[PDB]
Amino acid sequence: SYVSLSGLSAAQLDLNTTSNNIANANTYGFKESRAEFADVYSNSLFTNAKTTPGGGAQASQVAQQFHEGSSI
Amino acid sequence: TQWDSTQFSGDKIWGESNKGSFGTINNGMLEQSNIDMTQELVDLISAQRNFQANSRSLEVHNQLQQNILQI
Structure with a gap:
Protein backbone atom coordinates (compact mmCIF):
# COMPACT_ATOMS: atom_id res chain seq x y z
CA SER A 1 0.00 0.00 0.00
CA TYR A 2 2.96 2.30 0.62
CA VAL A 3 4.04 1.86 -3.00
CA SER A 4 0.58 2.98 -4.10
CA LEU A 5 0.79 5.93 -1.71
CA SER A 6 4.14 6.87 -3.25
CA GLY A 7 2.53 6.69 -6.69
CA LEU A 8 -0.30 8.93 -5.52
CA SER A 9 2.20 11.42 -4.11
CA ALA A 10 4.18 11.45 -7.37
CA ALA A 11 1.03 11.95 -9.45
CA GLN A 12 -0.13 14.78 -7.19
CA LEU A 13 3.30 16.44 -7.35
CA ASP A 14 3.17 16.33 -11.15
CA LEU A 15 -0.37 17.70 -11.01
CA ASN A 16 0.77 20.58 -8.79
CA THR A 17 3.71 21.33 -11.09
CA THR A 18 1.43 21.44 -14.13
CA SER A 19 -1.05 23.63 -12.23
CA ASN A 20 1.73 26.06 -11.34
CA ASN A 21 2.88 26.15 -14.97
CA ILE A 22 -0.67 26.88 -16.13
CA ALA A 23 -1.23 29.54 -13.46
CA ASN A 24 1.98 31.34 -14.42
CA VAL A 62 11.60 19.61 -10.03
CA ALA A 63 13.45 20.90 -13.08
CA GLN A 64 13.60 24.56 -14.14
CA GLN A 65 13.72 24.33 -17.95
CA PHE A 66 15.28 27.58 -19.14
CA HIS A 67 14.47 27.48 -22.84
CA GLU A 68 13.87 30.89 -24.39
CA GLY A 69 10.26 32.04 -24.24
CA SER A 70 8.25 34.04 -26.72
CA SER A 71 8.55 37.82 -26.89
CA ILE A 72 5.72 40.35 -26.93
CA THR B 1 12.87 2.02 19.25
CA GLN B 2 16.44 2.26 20.51
CA TRP B 3 19.16 -0.37 20.75
CA ASP B 4 22.46 -0.71 22.59
CA SER B 5 25.55 -2.83 21.94
CA THR B 6 25.83 -5.86 24.22
CA GLN B 7 28.37 -8.69 24.40
CA PHE B 8 26.57 -10.85 21.83
CA SER B 9 26.04 -7.89 19.50
CA GLY B 10 29.75 -7.02 19.52
CA ASP B 11 31.13 -3.48 19.40
CA LYS B 12 29.85 -0.36 17.68
CA ILE B 13 31.67 0.19 14.38
CA TRP B 14 31.64 3.87 13.44
CA GLY B 15 31.64 5.05 9.84
CA GLU B 16 30.40 7.64 7.39
CA SER B 17 27.46 7.57 4.97
CA ASN B 18 27.81 5.73 1.65
CA LYS B 19 31.26 4.48 2.66
CA GLY B 20 32.32 0.85 2.72
CA SER B 21 29.44 -1.38 3.81
CA PHE B 22 27.30 1.47 5.14
CA GLY B 23 24.16 2.75 3.45
CA THR B 24 23.02 6.21 2.46
CA ILE B 25 21.19 8.94 4.36
CA ASN B 26 18.11 10.50 2.77
CA ASN B 27 16.47 13.64 4.13
CA GLY B 28 12.72 14.16 4.09
CA MET B 29 11.84 10.49 4.66
CA LEU B 30 10.95 8.25 7.59
CA GLU B 31 10.99 4.50 8.18
CA GLN B 32 7.75 2.68 8.94
CA SER B 33 7.45 -0.68 10.67
CA ASN B 34 8.84 -3.57 8.64
CA ILE B 35 5.70 -5.66 9.10
CA ASP B 36 3.09 -7.13 6.77
CA MET B 37 -0.46 -7.02 8.12
CA THR B 38 -1.57 -10.05 6.10
CA GLN B 39 1.22 -12.19 7.54
CA GLU B 40 0.57 -10.94 11.07
CA LEU B 41 -3.15 -11.75 10.88
CA VAL B 42 -2.53 -15.20 9.38
CA ASP B 43 0.02 -15.96 12.11
CA LEU B 44 -2.52 -14.75 14.67
CA ILE B 45 -5.09 -17.22 13.34
CA SER B 46 -2.58 -20.07 13.33
CA ALA B 47 -1.43 -19.27 16.87
CA GLN B 48 -5.03 -19.27 18.07
CA ARG B 49 -5.55 -22.66 16.41
CA ASN B 50 -2.45 -24.09 18.10
CA PHE B 51 -3.53 -22.66 21.47
CA GLN B 52 -6.94 -24.30 21.07
CA ALA B 53 -5.32 -27.63 20.20
CA ASN B 54 -3.04 -27.50 23.25
CA SER B 55 -5.97 -26.58 25.49
CA ARG B 56 -7.84 -29.59 24.08
CA SER B 57 -4.89 -31.83 24.93
CA LEU B 58 -4.77 -30.43 28.47
CA GLU B 59 -8.51 -31.05 28.82
CA VAL B 60 -7.98 -34.65 27.69
CA HIS B 61 -5.26 -35.09 30.32
CA ASN B 62 -7.54 -33.68 33.03
CA GLN B 63 -10.42 -35.92 31.95
CA LEU B 64 -8.16 -38.98 32.08
CA GLN B 65 -6.96 -38.04 35.57
CA GLN B 66 -10.54 -37.53 36.76
CA ASN B 67 -11.61 -40.86 35.25
CA ILE B 68 -8.76 -42.58 37.10
CA LEU B 69 -9.80 -40.79 40.29
CA GLN B 70 -13.35 -42.19 40.11
CA ILE B 71 -12.34 -45.78 40.86
Whole structure:
Protein backbone atom coordinates (compact mmCIF):
# COMPACT_ATOMS: atom_id res chain seq x y z
CA SER A 1 0.00 0.00 0.00
CA TYR A 2 2.96 2.30 0.62
CA VAL A 3 4.04 1.86 -3.00
CA SER A 4 0.58 2.98 -4.10
CA LEU A 5 0.79 5.93 -1.71
CA SER A 6 4.14 6.87 -3.25
CA GLY A 7 2.53 6.69 -6.69
CA LEU A 8 -0.30 8.93 -5.52
CA SER A 9 2.20 11.42 -4.11
CA ALA A 10 4.18 11.45 -7.37
CA ALA A 11 1.03 11.95 -9.45
CA GLN A 12 -0.13 14.78 -7.19
CA LEU A 13 3.30 16.44 -7.35
CA ASP A 14 3.17 16.33 -11.15
CA LEU A 15 -0.37 17.70 -11.01
CA ASN A 16 0.77 20.58 -8.79
CA THR A 17 3.71 21.33 -11.09
CA THR A 18 1.43 21.44 -14.13
CA SER A 19 -1.05 23.63 -12.23
CA ASN A 20 1.73 26.06 -11.34
CA ASN A 21 2.88 26.15 -14.97
CA ILE A 22 -0.67 26.88 -16.13
CA ALA A 23 -1.23 29.54 -13.46
CA ASN A 24 1.98 31.34 -14.42
CA ALA A 25 0.97 31.46 -18.11
CA ASN A 26 0.95 35.28 -18.08
CA THR A 27 3.79 36.05 -15.64
CA TYR A 28 6.61 37.92 -17.37
CA GLY A 29 9.91 36.08 -17.58
CA PHE A 30 8.59 32.94 -15.89
CA LYS A 31 10.30 29.62 -16.62
CA GLU A 32 8.30 26.40 -16.55
CA SER A 33 9.06 23.45 -14.28
CA ARG A 34 9.22 19.74 -15.04
CA ALA A 35 8.79 16.91 -12.53
CA GLU A 36 11.28 14.04 -12.78
CA PHE A 37 10.94 10.87 -10.70
CA ALA A 38 13.11 7.89 -9.82
CA ASP A 39 12.65 4.29 -8.77
CA VAL A 40 13.18 3.06 -5.20
CA TYR A 41 14.94 -0.15 -4.24
CA SER A 42 16.34 -1.51 -0.98
CA ASN A 43 20.02 -2.31 -0.46
CA SER A 44 19.92 -4.67 2.51
CA LEU A 45 22.97 -6.79 3.29
CA PHE A 46 21.04 -10.01 2.61
CA THR A 47 18.71 -9.12 -0.27
CA ASN A 48 16.99 -11.88 -2.23
CA ALA A 49 16.56 -9.46 -5.17
CA LYS A 50 14.86 -12.05 -7.38
CA THR A 51 12.19 -12.53 -4.70
CA THR A 52 11.92 -8.86 -3.67
CA PRO A 53 9.61 -6.46 -5.55
CA GLY A 54 10.15 -2.74 -6.06
CA GLY A 55 9.82 -0.03 -3.45
CA GLY A 56 7.64 2.49 -5.25
CA ALA A 57 8.52 5.83 -6.84
CA GLN A 58 10.45 8.75 -5.34
CA ALA A 59 10.45 12.33 -6.58
CA SER A 60 13.95 13.19 -7.79
CA GLN A 61 13.83 16.90 -8.59
CA VAL A 62 11.60 19.61 -10.03
CA ALA A 63 13.45 20.90 -13.08
CA GLN A 64 13.60 24.56 -14.14
CA GLN A 65 13.72 24.33 -17.95
CA PHE A 66 15.28 27.58 -19.14
CA HIS A 67 14.47 27.48 -22.84
CA GLU A 68 13.87 30.89 -24.39
CA GLY A 69 10.26 32.04 -24.24
CA SER A 70 8.25 34.04 -26.72
CA SER A 71 8.55 37.82 -26.89
CA ILE A 72 5.72 40.35 -26.93
CA THR B 1 12.87 2.02 19.25
CA GLN B 2 16.44 2.26 20.51
CA TRP B 3 19.16 -0.37 20.75
CA ASP B 4 22.46 -0.71 22.59
CA SER B 5 25.55 -2.83 21.94
CA THR B 6 25.83 -5.86 24.22
CA GLN B 7 28.37 -8.69 24.40
CA PHE B 8 26.57 -10.85 21.83
CA SER B 9 26.04 -7.89 19.50
CA GLY B 10 29.75 -7.02 19.52
CA ASP B 11 31.13 -3.48 19.40
CA LYS B 12 29.85 -0.36 17.68
CA ILE B 13 31.67 0.19 14.38
CA TRP B 14 31.64 3.87 13.44
CA GLY B 15 31.64 5.05 9.84
CA GLU B 16 30.40 7.64 7.39
CA SER B 17 27.46 7.57 4.97
CA ASN B 18 27.81 5.73 1.65
CA LYS B 19 31.26 4.48 2.66
CA GLY B 20 32.32 0.85 2.72
CA SER B 21 29.44 -1.38 3.81
CA PHE B 22 27.30 1.47 5.14
CA GLY B 23 24.16 2.75 3.45
CA THR B 24 23.02 6.21 2.46
CA ILE B 25 21.19 8.94 4.36
CA ASN B 26 18.11 10.50 2.77
CA ASN B 27 16.47 13.64 4.13
CA GLY B 28 12.72 14.16 4.09
CA MET B 29 11.84 10.49 4.66
CA LEU B 30 10.95 8.25 7.59
CA GLU B 31 10.99 4.50 8.18
CA GLN B 32 7.75 2.68 8.94
CA SER B 33 7.45 -0.68 10.67
CA ASN B 34 8.84 -3.57 8.64
CA ILE B 35 5.70 -5.66 9.10
CA ASP B 36 3.09 -7.13 6.77
CA MET B 37 -0.46 -7.02 8.12
CA THR B 38 -1.57 -10.05 6.10
CA GLN B 39 1.22 -12.19 7.54
CA GLU B 40 0.57 -10.94 11.07
CA LEU B 41 -3.15 -11.75 10.88
CA VAL B 42 -2.53 -15.20 9.38
CA ASP B 43 0.02 -15.96 12.11
CA LEU B 44 -2.52 -14.75 14.67
CA ILE B 45 -5.09 -17.22 13.34
CA SER B 46 -2.58 -20.07 13.33
CA ALA B 47 -1.43 -19.27 16.87
CA GLN B 48 -5.03 -19.27 18.07
CA ARG B 49 -5.55 -22.66 16.41
CA ASN B 50 -2.45 -24.09 18.10
CA PHE B 51 -3.53 -22.66 21.47
CA GLN B 52 -6.94 -24.30 21.07
CA ALA B 53 -5.32 -27.63 20.20
CA ASN B 54 -3.04 -27.50 23.25
CA SER B 55 -5.97 -26.58 25.49
CA ARG B 56 -7.84 -29.59 24.08
CA SER B 57 -4.89 -31.83 24.93
CA LEU B 58 -4.77 -30.43 28.47
CA GLU B 59 -8.51 -31.05 28.82
CA VAL B 60 -7.98 -34.65 27.69
CA HIS B 61 -5.26 -35.09 30.32
CA ASN B 62 -7.54 -33.68 33.03
CA GLN B 63 -10.42 -35.92 31.95
CA LEU B 64 -8.16 -38.98 32.08
CA GLN B 65 -6.96 -38.04 35.57
CA GLN B 66 -10.54 -37.53 36.76
CA ASN B 67 -11.61 -40.86 35.25
CA ILE B 68 -8.76 -42.58 37.10
CA LEU B 69 -9.80 -40.79 40.29
CA GLN B 70 -13.35 -42.19 40.11
CA ILE B 71 -12.34 -45.78 40.86
